Amino acid sequence: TNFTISVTTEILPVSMTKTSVDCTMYICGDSTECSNLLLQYGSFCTQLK
Amino acid sequence: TSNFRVQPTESIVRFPNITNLCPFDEVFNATRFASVYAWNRKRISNCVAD
Numbered sequence: 001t002n003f004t005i006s007v008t009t010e011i012l013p014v015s016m017t018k019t020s021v022d023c024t025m026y027i028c029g030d031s032t033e034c035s036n037l038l039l040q041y042g043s044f045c046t047q048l049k
Numbered sequence: 050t051s052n053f054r055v056q057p058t059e060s061i062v063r064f065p066n067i068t069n070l071c072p073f074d075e076v077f078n079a080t081r082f083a084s085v086y087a088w089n090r091k092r093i094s095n096c097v098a099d
C-alpha cells in the first residue's frame with residue numbers, strides 16, 4: 001500500500017596509475033659492464049617494455 | 050625508444066686524511082739499532098702507514 005525511495009552506492013574500479021619501468025636503469029643503472037652484459041639476455045627488456 | 054641520462058666526469062669526494070697516526074720516525078730515526086743475534090721486534094697496528 002506504500003513505497004519508499006532509497007539510494008545505494010556502488011563502487012567499481014576502472015583503472016590504476018599507469019606504470020613504466022626501464023630494465024637497465026632499475027637493475028644496475030650507470031654501469032657500463034652491466035650494460036654490455038645485459039644485451040646477451042636477448043629481448044627480455046623489449047618484452048617487458 | 051630510449052632513456053635520457055647524463056654521465057659523470059670526475060671522481061673526487063672530500064679530501065685525504067691519514068696523518069700517519071703511528072710514528073714510523075721513532076723506529077726509523079734512532080741513534081742506536083739492534084744486532085743480528087738480538088733483533089728488536091716491533092709490532093705496529095691500529096695506525097696508518099705512509
Ligand SMILES: *[C@@H]1O[C@H](CO)[C@@H](O[C@@H]2O[C@H](CO)[C@@H](O)[C@H](O)[C@H]2NC(C)=O)[C@H](O)[C@H]1NC(C)=O
Binds near residue numbers: 001002003
Ligand atoms: C507512505 O509513507 C510515507 C512516509 O513513509 C508517509 O508520509 C508521511 O505521512 C505522515 C502523515 O500521513 C506525515 O506525518 C509524515 O511527515 C510523512 N512522511 C514524509 C517523509 O513526508 C505516507 O503517509 C504513507 N502513505 C500511506 C498511504 O500510508
Ligand SMILES: *[C@@H]1O[C@H](CO)[C@@H](O)[C@H](O)[C@H]1NC(C)=O
Binds near residue numbers: 078079080
Ligand atoms: C732524523 O732524520 C734526519 C734526516 O735523516 C736527520 O737529519 C736527524 O738528525 C734525525 N734525527 C736524529 C735525532 O738523529
